[PDB]
Amino acid sequence: GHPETLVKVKDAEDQLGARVGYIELDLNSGKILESFRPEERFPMMSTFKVLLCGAVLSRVDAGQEQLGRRIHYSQNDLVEYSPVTEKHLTDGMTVRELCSAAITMSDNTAANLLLTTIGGPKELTAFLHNMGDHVTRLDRWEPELNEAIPNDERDTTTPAAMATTLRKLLTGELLTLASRQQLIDWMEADKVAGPLLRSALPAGWFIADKSGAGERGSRGIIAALGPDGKPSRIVVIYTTGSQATMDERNRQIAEIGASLIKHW
Hints:
Layout (H helix, E strand, L loop, with lengths): L3 H13 L2 E8 L5 E5 L5 E2 L4 H15 L7 E2 L21 E2 H10 L3 H10 L3 H10 L25 E2 L1 H13 L5 H12 L8 H4 L5 E8 L5 E8 L6 E8 L5 H17 L2
Antiparallel strand pairs: 1-2, 1-9, 3-6, 4-5, 7-8, 8-9
PDB class: hydrolase
Keywords: Hydrolase, Beta-lactamase
Assembly: monomeric
């Protein structure tokens, strides 16, 4: 081990006045390289949308779902922050287009439509349970799942549960090679995480990620990244409770990123 990245995480808790959870693990082996508050609960916020598309792709592999299936919805279905879904009220969107919106843009209505396809949030929790994650739970829809009430276990994960689940989705036995490639392709094309780990990422490095933001200062990111255009580690960072500006929360996550890249 080495101290420098955990010192940045402690610095982040000092300057945000809030808990930060962190885990760095080896993508192939699953070996934890370093951690901080690994068994504490944090609100998932939009980071759940990757797990949601993992559940959709499992159903695609089984033939219970088709990526080209077209879904139509109405004005009444649109919730706050629906940048893609708000443009397709007349033509609808394919399951594939919905997962692209939920992951690349964090589209909230797209995540609700996908949750409907699997029977809702408790059915996402049953999928996670069945793949060996007995900690992570989704309970509510967009936008209520972002409430981040202190001590409320609803819509929460731990850094260690989320990192091990993301490893199993991206590189584990659960999904076909085609479904693994699609999930990381969506994450690679994330457009709403620019000021987080991507701000620290050197030129030729790979990153596939998913950001989140909720109430009470809740902010986080899940990522597969590494040098030479190939992912080799998973990083999960969560914080909740901070009264700091979004820009300070973003800078703290990017500073933890700069540290873990420097000490790779």
